[PDB]
Ligand binder design. Structure first.
Ligand SMILES: C=CC[S@](=O)C[C@H](N)C(=O)O
Lengths: 374, 376
């Protein structure tokens, strides 16, 4: 069921008012949230007082149990609260680097990684496009660490290309972080949408030593489409780094999350297991359906196959500018996507689309892509 | 009617496990939130998607309307900045408008986050302590002017003043702006809407175009309507150059606006709940009257200064000549009540306590029976 999202103050569906537009840019799904979550949220409103709230007594076990998803054994003492992964990227920047020290990213990558480093020096190690996918340039990556890299921002799974890194990839990158003592911030916000042939490998799960150097940021906000509820869990095994993170959160006046962030994250992590099994097969089939429609009906585009709900498509054979592509997609396509040039080196002449939609919606998303470039 | 708040993850009621305790320490009310907030929140959940949301289309008019209807403050839509709470906004203000180890001034006895945010951000804590006279507080303007001569860059002002409850007159704020004009001002007006019949909240940036371009004004419905767990706050900054450097700091720390229900509750709070706020003012003041007399009549060994707004009561316990732990233990052991210690508010908080009178009179009379009982 396509659900009307116009008139809901949703950034995706309400920022543009021309009702002819199809929106597939912002990375939230157009699906009903799991009912267990909604039942807890309407249950909580039955108490008409919204004063200051504590984190629940049980919240530590629930998250430690959610080993159920990745067989990582954590302790309750590691969990830190954040209103979103973006503040935790900034706090991890300001905690573990000095001003004018460098921070490394692997484009094409989520732009906030670029903007938050507004605070530090840009170092890049763009990934290499191989075999209809992306791979890390480990020789070049270590060529950057030989210059003094202090922090690395890892995306796993990697937006926008959709890479779910293997254990061997992380180890050999882990082998370089140990060897050069690079601190790692692991933005694993998509850790819960993984396809049938892949398995998410938490970076700190690999080792006792990589655990003491990695800050792992997770949330149900993207997985369960509750990104307006602002729940995030940051796991820091190293006690000495955890306190410097929490100092950078305390002197900014952050004192924990709001009533609905606590309530939703508790239900999402306890009672929503079967809905997440469903959404994985619907999303994976939406990626499969889309990758063939580009074979049959748009042979001038190259789509990088994801392994974990965003689709990364090469539009380089078209020889179009971003201004040429954007205007065309809006005028005849009547569809709003993300321009890829803002993803950095390797995002040029690409677009990113949201496949977290009903297949009915996905067909018009592709029908208008064909019309645009036919 | 007292409403059960035990087992709700309330900091007030669930931090202590002794079920015999009566709690009046933290500054949230035990009152039903206005029903139109409950209706706005239940209306939103009928839409089962909580993705990323924009601030509402009308919220700028409502905010502009609210500040003119309550304070006759004509503001423009470009001045409104959103914050998840005033403690982040105080911290944001310290970071935008000072450099490290520069001086920021506060007036104790005052909200402790004014102490903690200044020092944790490696700025110099400067004070200009308030002076107790005739069971109210007045500013030591001679002392205040002395500290400004040392190069003070910032001042964090509380209006009205937690914990004492002072609602500054226009003459005082006129006199205080005159010294700031001879200092950047952060105005923590989170209590701006609970004011008693004989008093009027005087916005500092309302006084003049001269004080507007040097003042950052923090306001919220969180304390007024008891929705402080939803984290809605409104920052007004008329000076363009000051607004952008504040929003710059928010951006570098990943803030992109508030949560779905903070907008949803705040939008209703400023539109359809006006009569509920008339109710709560008259209930609070008579609760402040009832309390101030019971300690007049039946606890004559305590002197409480009369508040002119909000719902906190500032009470001196020095005639008892007890240390804080001497005093605290008696309240938790013998009183079976948790109140706010004063010593953590700074100079002039020694041997005082702060109690919450935002409760039904039923609770309020038992709160006082035990406070007498505690020290009899
Ligand atoms: C002991 C709690 C610290 S305090 O009660 C926090 C609240 N905003 C207030 O103004 O009181």
């Amino acid at each position: 069921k396509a659900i009307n999202r116009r008139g809901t103050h949703s950034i995706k569906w309400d920022t543009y008012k021309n009702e002819e537009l199809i929106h597939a840019w912002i990375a939230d799904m157009d699906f009903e949230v799991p009912k267990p979550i909604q039942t807890a949220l309407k249950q909580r409103i039955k108490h008409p007082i919204f004063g200051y709230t504590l984190p629940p007594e049980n919240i530590g076990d629930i998250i430690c149990n959610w080993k159920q998803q990745y067989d990582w054994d954590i302790q309750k003492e590691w969990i830190v609260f954040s209103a979103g992964i973006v503040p935790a990227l900034s706090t991890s920047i300001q905690a573990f680097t000095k001003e004018n020290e460098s921070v490394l990213v692997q484009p094409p990558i989520y732009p906030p990684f670029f903007e938050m480093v507004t605070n530090r020096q840009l170092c890049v190690s763009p990934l290499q496009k191989q075999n209809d996918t992306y791979v890390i340039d480990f020789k070049h990556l270590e060529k950057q660490f030989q210059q003094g890299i202090k922090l690395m921002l890892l995306c796993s799974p990697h937006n926008p290309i959709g890479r779910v890194w293997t254990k061997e990839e992380l180890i050999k990158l882990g082998s370089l972080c140990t060897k050069y003592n690079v601190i790692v911030v692991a933005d694993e916000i998509h850790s819960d949408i993984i396809y049938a042939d892949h398995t998410h490998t938490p970076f700190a799960s690999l080792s006792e030593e990589l655990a003491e150097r990695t800050i792992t940021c997770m949330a149900p906000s993207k997985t369960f489409n509750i990104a307006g509820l602002q729940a995030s869990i940051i796991i820091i095994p190293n006690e000495k780094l955890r306190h410097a993170f929490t100092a950078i959160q305390y002197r900014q006046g952050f004192h924990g999350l709001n009533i609905f962030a606590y309530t939703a994250m508790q239900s999402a992590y306890t009672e929503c297991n079967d809905w997440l099994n469903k959404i994985r097969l619907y999303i994976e089939d939406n990626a499969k359906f889309a990758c063939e429609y580009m074979k049959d009906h748009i042979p001038t585009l190259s789509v990088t196959k994801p392994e974990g709900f965003l689709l990364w498509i090469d539009c380089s054979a078209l020889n179009l500018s971003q201004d040429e592509r954007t205007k065309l997609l809006e005028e005849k396509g009547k569809i709003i996507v993300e321009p890829g040039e803002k993803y950095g080196l390797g995002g040029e002449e690409h677009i990113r689309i949201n496949i977290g939609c009903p297949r009915s919606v996905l067909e018009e998303i592709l029908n208008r892509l064909r019309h645009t470039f036919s």
